[PDB]
């Protein structure tokens, strides 16, 4: 184990120092490298249980067993006296910069995962390039550095969700004694978009500054992997060139799909366009039933819009379907209309978008229900939220040998390695992984540490918590009830559940028994918590801390012995007692 | 210890059935008791690991080793045929109601702990009385059933905190595109109090209905324990009588203290009066620096009031002082004035409260600072928040033998037992325990199960999470940093910390580096999390789930391997990396 780890670490690290924290010769070398502005990884052998074995194995590369030992790109450079010699003779800079490739790491994609990986690799002295290019949407929308979450995902969507939540805060404020009249207050879409876009612009700029400050080369260029170590880049002026890299990280993400029906690309939009749209969508049809579809429909309705969601089959496929039904029922009680069991056939244009008066156009949507009955209605905006897809055919030449699955995602080992030994993939394009921003970030950071700092820690993709930011939010960690029953059998599953009412909803005269939580547990394993589910305000804040406990193997007894914080919504997890098997009502 | 447990269980239970889930004879006995409206505890021997030894040890009472076996107040009643004989002969009701005392349980105090204990005991057939009486405040304020939290504590305070938080929501709404103008909106104190009090009234009524539905006798009477089994009650018409009970639970709580200075009782108020006050306090001085003092000052300022807090020494004594300073600094930047290192000497009346026109009076407060300088300022309302005290000299006759500590609280074992063996104490009067509503509720419920259902589970009072509902909320679980350093030494403590900015604060132009969190960890115990601290919105929702993980022994590695939910405040705990020892800034 140790010899294999050391060989892999030495071969892959850009600049690495084997050290001991007590040794003054090691401190002197560290001080020289810091003065020279040479970044590097450091392995403190006295801080590792197998450090003595590592010292012995180092002689297989350097012929010495002492510390310090400096390596650059697989080559032993020297001990203390030698490194000081190179520094004194002004030779060290050239040595640490010598490389077979232009870069130690090329990251293709400057989104959540790619920026995290590139910044982390640079900390260990890896010469790093991050490529990011945003192909415009069909109507021409484009945006800056940072990827989907920053520009057209989690960040703007949650800010618009907050704008929507504030509608109810205005209503509640009256009951709490404030003098406003909610019925005389209106919402200005353009003012909200300006504020959202100003924040996004600060993030775009902050990422460019962060790459500069980490000595990462940022290329606003489209990359294509043409062989294991060669990336062809096309710049803003269509100039084509090739750069080379030792390790390659594919982090190119996904883009929205469109249905293959007349008028969809021409006259509809997707989430990519929504978050910078200069005019309020107006009367809107959302086609689809993913979390993207429902989150966007929810905030548009809360802002005062006339919104309909066209659902082919079910809501939130892949999520617990009891929770999905409760999410949709709340939305329907709060203004969202649903066209159920329905698909679109064609979008016809009745009015062109009025860019001068800043108004949407008008569309005729024709569709049909599963029984064959026709759907026909006019909408000012049609938003397609019918899934997202990787677009690797343009990122990857087929001759490179990177295996893709049937959906076009990259088939990766548990350490993100593709079928090409120096090429890795992270984020939404890594087949089978949860498609979430903090997952991409952890994967990229942890991978960079394994490549360039000798780390061994893998990303754990199990029991990753989620939150759907619908008008009433839905947080979850672990299995749905139906997946738990499928895996273990109904007789081995116990479900504890309860309704609850936020204290803030009492004086506000809101609903008594809409918020809901459950714990899905395995009886034969000490009532292990297999899944946690909560519908209520601030559901992501509620869920997050429990994800640590679930990671640690929490049981129902662990929830019971923990004392609640009062008054909170979250504390209702600490006193659950009604089982579904008992048939006793969960109402409070 | 099976023999000792069975002896204690049979001796204490009111009505108890020993059964097996796999027995249709037990099913018949359960059905008969259910039809007879006879509530009882049930111990399913097949579900316990030592069930076989219990069956054998039951014969020491019943001379049989089969199930079912029924017991009443220490006496074996019979098997299947025998219980049916009594039922057929109309003898069973008399048998199950025979008792040496009027009640199996008398609970003195109808607050958080006492109501929880009384309701739980009644589930197992314990004939239960709950006594509750609310001695009026000096100005005459009184309230209904439910105790401090329901009437004059957590419930109204959090509702008034929410009214205060809505001030900032109104401001934020403008930046999110809503057309209101916060500067022309005002707050109506009386409207908010009316709504708060209507909710409280629904809780008072709900508790009365809950006791009725559980067959608990509710006496709105002042109780005094005059001997181990005798409680003297004084009813609303001053009629004095004595009732007897087998077990006694003392759950009488505490009341606000006043400083011993002229004018304090006559002209000041406390939290007991604030939550139903019919007029806005106006310009207000809060004397004290507890969480009660700061929570009330905070919401009064957010409602638009002119508020000053007079602090003898420090804020939030007993809490992490770095966090306390950050809490206070936020309040000072958001309208709360602080008179630091200052104590009051006298409250002088300048105008009497005008009850007819619903206006406060006017007071002159004289005090002095530690540097000798004088304090002299006028206020419309003076609120004392200088601690709370038990008042057991009127609850307990000294001859009973219940030992109190130097502060007047009850000295209890880890199972809530006093020095008188049938008398227990729960909630705020139990010396040394966290004085919180969910603690009182757990203690009461768990104690009732041990007394009347043979349970053995104790309440765990360690690492009980808290939240201070100041304008920026402060959640904590475990040790303060200073307590951890005192216990383990600075060299064995590592502190990970970060500022954060809620995404909701970006478009709203709120502060960049005021929200803050830290994990206080023990290096030599695998970086065990000793204390978690968070200052930010929704801090109780953030903190609660982590309390389960801390109960389970979470380490820093457990936080690191858990993935964040994005975008949330809570996810910041999953990526902490800056140590205090490193000196690196925690700013974003
Ligand atoms: C509407 C919406 C809401 C979401 N909400 C949440 C949420 O609340 N929480 C959450 O955790 N996740 C959320 N997500 C998911 C999250 O956005 C993604 O999981 C995350 O952005 C994936 O990161 P990534 O690094 O894999 O890819 P991306 O962030 O998509 O980055 C890939 C980047 O590479 C660029 N690129 C593509 N091809 C090339 C090429 N050939 N050369 C150069 N650059 C290229 C892309 O244009 C893009 O900039 C949401 C997504 C959407 C669409
Ligand atoms: C302003 C304030 C805010 C608080 N906020 C929170 C918070 O956010 N979260 C939290 O967890 N805790 C909070 N607390 C603490 C919480 O209120 C107490 O911990 C809890 O109420 C204690 O319950 P208890 O059963 O011990 O006593 P109590 O709830 O005080 O009940 C005791 C009852 O017994 C009655 N009684 C007294 N003597 C007699 C007698 N001789 N005969 C009959 N009846 C009698 C009393 O009048 C009262 O009704 C707060 C407290 C205050 C004062
Ligand atoms: Mg702005
Ligand atoms: Mg599942
Ligand atoms: Mg009302």
Numbering used by the authors:
A (entry chain A), B (entry chain B): 6 to 593
What does the paper say about this structure?
The S. mansoni TGR (SmTGR) (EC 1.8.1.9) is a homodimeric flavoprotein with a head-to-tail orientation between monomers. Like all mammalian TR, SmTGR is a selenoprotein carrying the amino acid selenocysteine (Sec597). Paired with Cys596, this residue directly participates in enzymatic catalysis together with FAD and at least two other cystine pairs (Cys28-S–S-Cys31 and Cys154-S–S-Cys159) with redox activity.
A high-resolution dataset was collected at the beamline I04-1 at 100 K and processed with the fully automated pipelines at Diamond Light Source49. The data obtained shows a crystalline form in the P 1 21 1 space group that allowed the generation of a 3D atomic model of the enzyme with 1.25 Å resolution. The missing residues on N-terminal (1–5) weren't included due to indistinct electron densities typical of terminal regions. The SmTGR Grx domain (1–107) stands out for presenting relatively higher values of anisotropic B-factor, reaching up to 110.63 A2. Considering the high resolution of our apo model, the relatively higher Grx domain B-factor can be an indicative of a high mobility of this domain.
